Amino acid sequence: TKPCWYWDKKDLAHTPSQLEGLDPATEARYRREGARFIFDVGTRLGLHYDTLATGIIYFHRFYMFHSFKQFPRYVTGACCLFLAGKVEETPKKCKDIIKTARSLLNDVQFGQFGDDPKEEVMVLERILLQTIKFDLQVEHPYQFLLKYAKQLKGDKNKIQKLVQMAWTFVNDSLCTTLSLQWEPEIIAVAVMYLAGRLCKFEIQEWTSKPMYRRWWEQFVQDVPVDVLEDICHQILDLYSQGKQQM
Amino acid sequence: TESDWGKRCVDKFDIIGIIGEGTYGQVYKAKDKDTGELVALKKVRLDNEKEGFPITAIREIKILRQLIHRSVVNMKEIVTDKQDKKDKGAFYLVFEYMDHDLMGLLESGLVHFSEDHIKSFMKQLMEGLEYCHKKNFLHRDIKCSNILLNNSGQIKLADFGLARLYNSEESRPYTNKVITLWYRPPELLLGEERYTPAIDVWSCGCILGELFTKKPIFQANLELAQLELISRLCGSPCPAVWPDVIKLPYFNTMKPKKQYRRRLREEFSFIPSAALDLLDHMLTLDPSKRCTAEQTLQSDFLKDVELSKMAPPDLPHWQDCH
Numbered sequence A: 001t002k003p004c005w006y007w008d009k010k011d012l013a014h015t016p017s018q019l020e021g022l023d024p025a026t027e028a029r030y031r032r033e034g035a036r037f038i039f040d041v042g043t044r045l046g047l048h049y050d051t052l053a054t055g056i057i058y059f060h061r062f063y064m065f066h067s068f069k070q071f072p073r074y075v076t077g078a079c080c081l082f083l084a085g086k087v088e089e090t091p092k093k094c095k096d097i098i099k100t101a102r103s104l105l106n107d108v109q110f111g112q113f114g115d116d117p118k119e120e121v122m123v124l125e126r127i128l129l130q131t132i133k134f135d136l137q138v139e140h141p142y143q144f145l146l147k148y149a150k151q152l153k154g155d156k157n158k159i160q161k162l163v164q165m166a167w168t169f170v171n172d173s174l175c176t177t178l179s180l181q182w183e184p185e186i187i188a189v190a191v192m193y194l195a196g197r198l199c200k201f202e203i204q205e206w207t208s209k210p211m212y213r214r215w216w217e218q219f220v221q222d223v224p225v226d227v228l229e230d231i232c233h234q235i236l237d238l239y240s241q242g243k244q245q246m
Numbered sequence B: 001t002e003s004d005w006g007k008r009c010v011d012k013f014d015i016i017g018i019i020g021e022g023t024y025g026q027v028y029k030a031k032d033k034d035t036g037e038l039v040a041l042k043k044v045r046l047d048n049e050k051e052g053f054p055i056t057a058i059r060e061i062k063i064l065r066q067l068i069h070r071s072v073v074n075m076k077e078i079v080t081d082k083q084d085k086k087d088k089g090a091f092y093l094v095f096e097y098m099d100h101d102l103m104g105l106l107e108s109g110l111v112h113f114s115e116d117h118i119k120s121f122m123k124q125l126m127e128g129l130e131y132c133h134k135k136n137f138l139h140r141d142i143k144c145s146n147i148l149l150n151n152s153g154q155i156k157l158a159d160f161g162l163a164r165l166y167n168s169e170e171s172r173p174y175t176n177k178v179i180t181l182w183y184r185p186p187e188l189l190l191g192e193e194r195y196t197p198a199i200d201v202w203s204c205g206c207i208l209g210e211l212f213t214k215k216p217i218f219q220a221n222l223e224l225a226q227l228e229l230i231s232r233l234c235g236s237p238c239p240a241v242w243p244d245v246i247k248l249p250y251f252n253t254m255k256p257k258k259q260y261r262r263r264l265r266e267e268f269s270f271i272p273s274a275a276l277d278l279l280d281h282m283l284t285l286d287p288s289k290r291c292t293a294e295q296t297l298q299s300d301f302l303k304d305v306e307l308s309k310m311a312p313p314d315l316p317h318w319q320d321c322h
């Protein structure tokens, strides 16, 4: 019935790009440049959070079956954003996605689109739909971040600060392969656990079981704290090397 | 774990011939070379598409991959043309091949359904429809030509080109013109956009009335003349039976030539009483009192309908061409 869209940590080490020689460090950079390309091109076009994440999820899934050495990332990123716009009922014309892509990529980067950039994106729509197996519907951690945080009763300012900082962590988790690892429900819970530590907030003090430390077990089921520590470590790695400000 | 669509090629199907003009592309009849099961292929051409893969087809796929029911048409897989990038080719949607549709069997004049044929048919149509409404989906094209029936006696809803989600929590606006004029309820004729799933119950009410008459109950060409024919039978809309009829945009504009009285049980007395009860509850102008899909399954005309103990209809095996 439904395909499985999640890989182990070992499965994420033998991607088609790893087989064709590309090193993990460079592939990690190719996914950041691609995710942030889709994000920016969608932001300048007025697209919202559920559309940008869907395109970025198509991007991460696409390069689980194809190699970066065979498909330019910025070309695939534009084709993912073009499809997500039609899937999420906020379609943007193919001409507008190109006119915005050239205003963000330099001559070398835009050289990936070739002579007819639009035609190079239309053709890639065929293989993109086949690579994702026509599985268009995708949920994202944003919707769960809101619902989970809405059932919290307590300090208004503290809870609001917890949400907006976790909101940025979800914007960053799209730069990694976390979506390829865990369900969005676990990602939304993890970013809250991470935000709660950096803010020194007692999230259990805002629920129905203030004595129960594992406050999250009332939102998602069977997720040990070690799994949360893994997601937090991968998100904080983006903040290493001063790549971003907390 | 082979639920991966789009990879299998179309040459695994032997095309027998075209069976109709589809929305995106022609519809073909073919048999599977690996299982010998007769199927139908909905072609989706991509070359020379202003926006690439049609968004109307993307909606149908997003919905069909969520509707698993005996009465809802099921999409087996999606197959592609022959490839080998930088090539042109279309996609094909695969469905189980139904033998007949409703609009054809009644026009054929060669068929006539008894009371047990209609009970089992409406039974399956309502159960599958209740499954869609519970999933917060609205079919918006229910008609005779969109009700497929195989020679086994199993009914299936046909194509969801105009289907959409429905926010049951808070009412939000939707698209007005959706259904063919013959099956369109009044609230849509008067310009309602925050309509409920009740627009399908009305179209299904005309299917039940059409099985006992072999001809559509309402046949008009313009929305105003359509409202004229509906009022002549169901009565004229007015706040006495519909407190919110005053709120509709075209209410005062599209006034019937007279203030008619409901004579439905008069013109449809040859129908059994239990069927007339369900027909009356399905053709009530006010959608707030129009029975839901679940309430039709609880009626006397369908509550004790046992599908297992049903005899197959006298359906012709000689499809009229090929």
Ligand SMILES: CN(C)C/C=C/C(=O)Nc1ccc(O[C@@H]2CCC[C@@H](Nc3ncc(Cl)c(-c4c[nH]c5ccccc45)n3)C2)cc1
Pocket (backbone or CB within 6 Å): B018, B019, B020, B021, B022, B027, B040, B041, B095, B096, B097, B098, B099, B100, B101, B104, B148, B149, B158, B159, B319, B320, B321, B322
């Ligand atoms: C005399 N006369 C008039 C002349 C001869 C003409 C003619 O008729 N030919 C032909 C026709 C038709 C056909 O067919 C049949 C009918 C009924 C139903 C069916 N079933 C079915 N199954 C499956 C499916 Cl998928 C389906 C669908 C869905 N949709 C669509 C759309 C379009 C098309 C399709 C379709 N369906 C069968 C076949 C053949």
